[model samples]
Target chain A: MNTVPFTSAPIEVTIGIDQYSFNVKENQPFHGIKDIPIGHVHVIHFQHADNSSMRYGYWFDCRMGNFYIQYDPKDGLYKMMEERDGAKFENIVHNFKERQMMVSYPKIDEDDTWYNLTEFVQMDKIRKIVRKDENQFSYVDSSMTTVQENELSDPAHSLNYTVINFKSREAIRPGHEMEDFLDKSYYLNTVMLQGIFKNSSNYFGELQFAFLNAMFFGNYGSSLQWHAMIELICSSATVPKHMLDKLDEILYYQIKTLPEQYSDILLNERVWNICLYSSFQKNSLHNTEKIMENKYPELL
Target chain B: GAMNSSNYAELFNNDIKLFVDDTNVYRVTVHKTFEGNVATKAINGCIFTLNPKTGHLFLKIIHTSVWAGQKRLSQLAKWKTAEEVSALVRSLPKEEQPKQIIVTRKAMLDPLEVHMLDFPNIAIRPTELRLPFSAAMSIDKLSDVVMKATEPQMVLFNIYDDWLDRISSYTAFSRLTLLLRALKTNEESAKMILLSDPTITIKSYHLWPSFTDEQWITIESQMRDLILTEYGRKYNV
Candidate 1:
């Protein structure tokens, strides 16, 4: 006897007080057209909407590396651009100018052009004035009290806290905890300097992607300087003398106020993106039943 | 850059040189002929897994596949940088220079693969075995028990299977991790009321009940976010 049960029931998962329902999804993968419901396993099911093709599907690159393909609004379609000569496409976010990254990251709580301190100051090195276990570390907090002399100069704090300050455009800043973290994060600096920007090709891709996001989309408020900094780094493209002259100052700024100034460039979602793009690409390659690019209309 | 150019003379030997990079990754030279080295070129990408229980670090490379061939994920060392990779490639004859450097799209190796590829070096990290093996053995065994155990356990598993036979990987991992964590920390609390009245102790080996969105995001936001991203449409604001 063949045991068969409810064939029409949709699966239900309750999210808190809300309930989401879905039906079985089947994909034959790799080839285009038709869910030939014949002895196939339904492995993947996702709510992919019709709004943004760029945000949904994965970019299959030449080297089998999946990447974020840019949305070319000029043609109003998401297509692969041969940005490199038959090499891997750059890892620019699929939906840039949307401030989606900011949404994922907590509000960093400021605006206005605060240039990196290294740009103006000719500092050799910052001496660690205090240790992690010092009394100054006691001021770890979210908000600052108005009472305190010498602008909360407790250099020994290991943890970061908001401290009282006056006579400043952006009233308060992160105290020693963050400053110390910024100072000590050597890998962060090196990766940005060596791993990312210094690779020459790496720098060009990111800079070009950021540059186009502003110029192509042009619907940006916060990301204008984000584009500007990218241009500054890419001046190496034109490599004019004055631009080259500003290189040290810019690079120093890139290192110094990393959390704020170049936060956009330093992708935090990078690790997650690999799994995500890979999974999607894997799914797409395996389940070619529905190709997003619809690469072959003749296949059917 | 670290290895000198003169070392290419040993290419003929049936020996392997194992190395540990500054990042503590182990590597071995397993190529047969200098000509054979030209035939195989692999690109290494890095993904790190933090030991959940210990908060230590475990690094691994991902195995990637092209249509015809698949690259093996590396256990030691992150992907060699260009200079180092170039050096590795340079040691091969000039014909190997143009070969496509194979890289994995899935740079985050499955934790099991990560554990398997690890070198049997002395002074093994205690963290190396526990998290990977613990979860590996636990989640499956625990799931097996749920499928066959007590009346309610099997019924519950049946019901879950009936509702949705297959689940997303992240959701599955979340449920497994949540179950392991619950059993380890709060075994008694996990025995709350089920679909049928008069509570039953799921005890040691049962999948964690799929928690509501609000309930899970409190602890496993990534899991919930990942699940939602994979399966559902309209999300609650």
Candidate 2:
């Protein structure tokens, strides 16, 4: 139960004024992950081809000792990709960036027990999201809230494909910005970073740290580390070969695709289920032998 | 069609039990009812032991109310809708089913450590449950949901196999690269679910019994490492 060799390799740092290239590796022993039951460091740190495609490397996880980066959304906001270790001056002001909302709400402790955390309700800050009458939401911190728009669930305005079955058909597949973000996956020339992550309040989780701040200067991925993690969303595997060679050259100069983009995605969900079975077969009392005699209990 | 192991572990919401061994291996046993005094059992209940044998076909795993606040180490309990474990292994009997089994569970922590499950073991009290994390069925997407439901999108292969297998032949995938080379020395809590029976005419995998042969040589060396790390990661076998 003792081992750490792989000690170091690509070192040469200086943060907050530039010059980097850190490396560490040597983290193994993961049979049912006893939290790195032994030597589990990573320390990686690449990013700096003057921000290769809007930021690309980070690993520093000597057992979550800090630094992780990936989340991405033109500057992710923080799952910690650079926070501690000799930057201790936490008494500054301004340059703000926020996104918190949360709310599940639960409580019991006065001793009847129940408080292992995740019982949120927190709002505190919500800046931009307008709509003031008809259902209420007026806020610029001028505070206002009251929604029920028929118990909301609008996947970009649903006709209900089970209201976008809350995503995943491999995260609605390489469409709308087809899967980028791996750095060993290059296309070059600025801004091609898109690893599609929507974050429906992250789940499950398992070891992760991914760093590379290359230290402050702004957009080159401001902060990230999403983590719903079962080893990077169920056994990490990706191939964004420049968004798969740019969504396959706008899919063969515009002519190709198959099942897994899911054959015109299950033929546009069976053409929106035969446009609601061709609007109930042209509203012709929608076929009924007393609706098959009330769906047959041996025809009553 | 016999059932009744206390009404099949009262159809899972908790204390999920489900056993069946005449040598057809079917151990479901979940966090088994333990709340008031927490003596032993620190976050343990997922021995999914699934997706390896793939044939003899009759399968199951339905217990959903979105698995009602699942506890004792609930990795979203994948295979979570074995559509209720393929309707209780086709209400069984045909040679006591399962030739491919997967019922794994272990929480050695760091899976997003807010810490939780501390009970008598010191106490960290941080239990985040954001839920919704399916990710299981990987025949690596079974060549895009394999076959026979006579197409027109067999509801797009029952929405990409969550409705389980929906058929992926090769005598149900030639013992999946001898079961992913007996789970290529596992990591990332292992996954490859798809527990047969969306009606390939029904029946099923191994291990549904009680422990010891030194725990069945640590469960046939784990279904052989879950089939050699799912044939060296996602069937590159």
Candidate 3:
């Protein structure tokens, strides 16, 4: 295979009216969004052929609950013009590399069975099927009318799925918000952007894409990423100093107030929500305190 | 002591399998059995080659139901021990071979002692299956502990063992990075324990033995790159 030299260049994204610049790095094989210029925003955009459809609209960076601002030539505007996190964006990138690989190395078609690209199911309906099993949940949209009527061992429809054993100790009981997030994840995985390159032509693309989306966005899956990142940020490693500094202050306050906030909950009862909630609360709290401390240091 | 049904029942129900080699490397597999009141046979089985050689203790689960599923289904045929298991393991391409093979059951520890004595090469190491330090008592509480400790010392939390089978591999990995961000642990001590299990998979249309041995090797390497890129960003090392 031929190789190309990696290159880095500055790129700009607009969320509404304001435009912000970020560093874009492209290697011989793939292009990527390396870093955000303003904040400690880490966006993973591995530009590939399969992801050509996602060239427009905003891709949500679930890491910080913010949208990856993208330029829209049609409207001539940079969409998602606000600084927000935990919200969904218009487009999501999933399994582009895997799908591209599948295109390059096409699997032999036999039995009229494997490559059925027309299987499109509603996102809302997918979540309902997923919420049923905390341990083992599987769905096949091809044969089954309702998710409840699906079977795990169906060889014929094994390629179709909503969730395959989405286990979670933290997800003790289901809630509407959590279900909504899961459904959104499923949609992103199964369905592509609305326009050109909207549908993946292969089974591996669809299967791998759906699986990747769930892993990145699902409740328990997000928790694992959360744990790893928190540990890294809390360290004294060389990183985006601004994000590190802000995160440090927020975590310090959360840790300081841990006793008061979670005194009632048992040790094992502690879940990912507490950590996420406390951080968001503390970040805002610290923001307010910073302004107050700056304006009136001698108030007391 | 009689097994705790709450704990062991979950293990037994899925027929969770763990394998350890001389290198101390281990693998874990769990069948995605139905959690509701559905027919036992309706479930599709899965096999996972799990965690790295980082930890010392290793284990597996045993149940008659799981073995029955293996016997009746060709999907799990490789998992069933005896000459069949040996044949499958030996037939693997040379690079995939582990040099040797041994099998153990969860419930038959005592009963199989005499039987195991016949294999003198099998050196049994007693391992206690206890809740992890950060995961003990309450999982949510561990969050607070890590957050609090982050100020004084760098903390590397090994959440892999606790979460490996709890969710999808992709989600488990996604959450690992998210949890790190939530805690804001940007210190050098802020590390994590990760287990790359090729067996960690969802139900798919791929035929029985969905992932070939070659594919599994490739998958594990790719998963490692993903973890290092995403998780490595925060830790820096």
Candidate 4:
């Protein structure tokens, strides 16, 4: 025969409680497989609502990274080893159509817990098949808390989350590149979702954008970045000057604050302090610059 | 009027070498120069003055550009003429107005002529006393010039216009400002210099201003605020 399989029929395989149907010839490896039996090869299929589909397979001779689960057609379940498996291996969920990968294996509680396989699996390998040629992935968390904090502090991580979220919800990856939408609106939305400014409504959005702009405009090289840093420290509405001084000292000391250490109290304090300090300095300069005519109305 | 001259003479001990005035009126020097490639003109200056009575020092930095050159984002749609410079001088606060204005270069006279003509009340010195140093002097040399000038009580208090061009220069100046401020407490004579950079200057009849409204204020003033607020401390500068 031919070097490539020209056509194939769809075959049925059972993974967990669900049954998936995939095309055999279409799923066959384009790469060389020397000693593997072709009969042992099977492709698992994933389909989205729009009827667009993707395929991933388990080849016995291929490395273990090939698939998330091995099927046991003998019992209409996944083939899992006791030592290698989690508590519930029967329901291994792998949706290749989207960048969503979850395994609903129950070990912790009565209800099953679905751990993100993307967090556990080697993402680089799967990314080649699923959003091939796409360097971006967006992450969405139903829990929202963990993912929200992750995106705020890490710039690269934030971009990936934004891209992936846009892709999964819109059913299309961003045609515009990551740099296209680095505007105030996008950052404001992200900050709000993270509950960064939940307490006070004033200039919280402005603060986030300023910090982002500082990093963007100057890339930390220009005076704008330092000015923005001062703004970021000042944005919290209720803190005192001493606290802002403390935050400045910390920033000057480390240049970074670990995300875990970022608490609402600290953020509020930093913001207030910055605002107060900036105003104090501004007033002093204005006093110094005041015209003699203004200072003595009688003279004018 | 003659007493003012005699008070100045007493401060310099009649040595008149540099003629730094000993009078209560702070003897100040305003030095202006141009920076950037010849095609792109960046005008910058500094004011140096000190009161021998109170040791408090002041420094103001003056910087403005006429035509937005290729490298900088901001530009003046038209070349700055004497009229705009005149307006700027008139707008300056009374305390900031120069008494005896000195021009270093003949070209500077074009922009500064308005100050002299409009404010005939003030004396306009010839262009012989421009800053002695270029923008590329070492910090030690700059500090030496400033220290030497102050030591004689008032022959001349020098400001290196080119020295304040870099962030490091400002850092060095902050330390100097602090040093002078400290010396004032001990009843020592010192200089007060103001570093002034006009955020934007547009010559009349220009088609457009070189920088957008957002960029104009952002570039010059933002850094000044940060440096002064955290004076004498090491930073990204």
For every candidate in turn, the CA RMSD to the true structure comes to 33.1, 28.7, 30.5, 25.2
Best by TM-score: 4
Q: Model 2 over residues B1-237: C-alpha lDDT tens digits?
A: 222223322222232122211111121333434565433232212212222222232222222233345553133332232213333444445454332222222121221111111111211111132111112222233222322212212111111122124334322232333333333334233332222223222121221222323543454556666655556777676
Question: lDDT tens digits, residues A1-300, model 3?
Answer: 111111221233211100122223322222223222222111122222333222222222223233333334575333333333222221121232333311121223352111121122222323333333321222222122212124314333222332322222121122222231222223222222122224322222233223222222222222222232342222212333454444444333323322333223211112223323333233333543464344323331
The estimated TM-scores of all candidates read: 0.16, 0.16, 0.16, 0.19
Model 4 lDDT tens row, A87-113 = 222223111212223222122345111
Docking quality (DockQ) for each candidate: 0.01, 0.01, 0.01, 0.01
Residue-level error in angstroms, candidate 2, position B117:
24
Candidate 3 accuracy as lDDT:
0.28
Q: Which prediction has more favorable DockQ, 1 or 4?
A: 4
Looking at model 3 chain B, which ten-residue stretch has the lowest summed lDDT?
A: B18-27
Instruction: Work out candidate 3's RMSD over C-alphas.
Output: 30.5
| Model 1, runs deviating above 4 Å | A1-300, B1-76, B79-83, B105-237
